């Protein structure tokens, strides 16, 4: 499989209610391993996965150092964008940043990213070539110049192509039991009569990891993408994910519908049918 390490940062200003809020979370694939919350008591990077709890005091020390470094950078960022967009100082604004790296099945660098948004819209982002920026508006363009002169892409390239993949790998081995485990989907189907001439057919895909999955309904082998309810893949809170696909079916016709399940955990895609 392909693996990823990602950092999610969220900064939200609170006009007259104190310092801006700063939340940071960090994931390895579909597992969250650490967090930082500007309102938490500790004021340090906390572990959110059992396999990072093993890290020594220096790691926590250094990640807590970096994490509030980021935090400060985001407390200043709220103010610059405000000036850039000529915004009142009365209203709350949101900044969002995301960076990380992807590795292939060989555990080798595949792609590196660094994205930034202001009030839910793309602000500035690092291209796949790690040498050029996508500025959205002129304000983003002033940021682009500034990051060009400070040679930030070069610095970020070394990070995503190196220390990122390097520590991703370490995490992978360190948490081998739950990071390198691929749980196939526990699948099952339900039949609910809606009226005397119709009935709901529900395909279930429970306790799987990773999150990726293809839950499809087909009638007479042809896909029913237009008339199927499909819920977004949701967390079960036990490290696994759940999902379902539902199709309303004319009673006496359950047998021509077939649910299809595609997941890394299965050697072969499942085809279930009501019967």
């Amino acid at each position: 499989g392909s693996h990823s390490m990602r950092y999610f940062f969220t900064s939200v200003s609170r006009p007259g209610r104190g310092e801006p809020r700063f939340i940071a979370v960090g994931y390895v694939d579909d597992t969250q391993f650490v967090r930082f919350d500007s309102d938490a008591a500790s004021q340090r990077m906390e572990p959110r996965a059992p396999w990072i709890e093993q890290e020594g005091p220096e790691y926590w020390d250094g990640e807590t150092r970096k994490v509030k470094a980021h935090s400060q950078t985001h407390r200043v960022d709220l103010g610059t964008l405000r000036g850039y967009y000529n915004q009142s100082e009365a209203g709350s604004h949101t900044v969002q940043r995301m960076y990380g790296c992807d590795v292939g099945s060989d555990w080798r660098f595949l792609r590196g990213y660094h994205q930034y948004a202001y009030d839910g819209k793309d602000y500035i982002a690092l291209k796949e070539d790690l040498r050029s920026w996508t500025a959205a508006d002129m304000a983003a363009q002033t940021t682009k110049h500034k990051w060009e002169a400070a040679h930030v892409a070069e610095q970020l390239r070394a990070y995503l192509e190196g220390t990122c993949v390097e520590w991703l790998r370490r995490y992978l081995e360190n948490g081998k039991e739950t990071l390198q485990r691929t749980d196939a989907p526990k699948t099952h189907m339900t039949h609910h009569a809606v009226s005397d001439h119709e009935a709901t057919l529900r395909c279930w895909a429970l306790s799987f990891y990773p999150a990726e999955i293809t839950l499809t309904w087909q009638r007479d082998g042809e896909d029913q993408t237009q008339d199927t309810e499909l819920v977004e893949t949701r967390p079960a809170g036990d490290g696994t994910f759940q999902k379902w696909a539902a199709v309303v079916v004319p009673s006496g016709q359950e047998q021509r519908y077939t649910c299809h399940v595609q997941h890394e955990g299965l050697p072969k895609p499942l085809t279930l049918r009501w019967e």
Partner: protein, 100 residues
Amino acid sequence: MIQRTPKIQVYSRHPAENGKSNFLNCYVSGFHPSDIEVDLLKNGERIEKVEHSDLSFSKDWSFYLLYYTEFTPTEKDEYACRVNHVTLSQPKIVKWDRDM
């Protein structure tokens, strides 16, 4: 300012079995901004011991969170999720359905 409305999923961690303890979940996703009020109810009453995941976001920048609480499903009891966000005129209420 962009304002995307929250998707709301109400479900149990494991299949519901009257008598057996579980976790009642309320998944909220795809919203913006991140200010959101989320509660789990039991027969209309607010479930006090409720926790939530740390705030994160998707590719498109919208936020998602997990609210959860330990619970023992019963034949009788009704659970729901009550959610409030700028994009909603009033609190949306979604009832648990063992099958949903």
